Amino acid sequence: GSHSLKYFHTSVSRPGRGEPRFISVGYVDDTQFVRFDNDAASPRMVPRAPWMEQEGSEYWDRETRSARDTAQIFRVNLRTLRGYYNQSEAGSHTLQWMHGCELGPDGRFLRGYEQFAYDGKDYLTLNEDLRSWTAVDTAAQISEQKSNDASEAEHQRAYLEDTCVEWLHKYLEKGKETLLHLEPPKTHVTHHPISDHEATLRCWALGFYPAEITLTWQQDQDTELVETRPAGDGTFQKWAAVVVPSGEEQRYTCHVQHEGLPEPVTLRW
């Protein structure tokens, strides 16, 4: 199937304390493999997946230099955007960066993205053609014009289409024993009577990888879904519940769709 290499950066200003906190996490599909956190004496990029621990010191030195450069840039940017919007330094503000590339089933480049946000709202967005930037606020257009002059879209497009793909393949090779392994969910249906008239049927899906899944209730009313949640060991969990009249429990089936299942699964209590 498809694969992706995604990074998420967060910088939060500390009004009177000098340097902002800067945290960067990297993902391959739904598996985290690296981390950079500037809340340290001598901050470095470290491995967060076991298949990354044979990586050499030249790799970690450069990622550390890139992470430190990025954090310095973000600190200046927090100072400039506070000026753009006429904000006081009494408050703490946030600057986030998400970018990634994804492959298709054929192993070749399918899509890349890159987006910036200030205090949780779209600040600067790389357009789907990877050729131009878009700003929503009037102040953000100041940054857009800086980046249009500097041909920033051309630098970012080169990273996404060539560099990100070449290193995503390298990670898939280094960790394929566990990254290319599909884990189908363990599914069962439970029953808890609310009253004499109605009972609850809850459809469980546990211990599956990747996170993408679909749970549907169907009758031969409204469904309550929960957000897919991490188990803590790299797999995910989810369930879907529906309230049904007592005595008609056998009429309702649960449908489960997941990439690890040879075919979709149907369940009855």
Binding site: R62, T70, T80, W97
Partner: peptide
């Protein structure tokens, strides 16, 4: 790998 730098705003 990480991009080398981020744009100055």
């Amino acid at each position: 790998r990480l991009p080398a730098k981020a744009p100055l705003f």
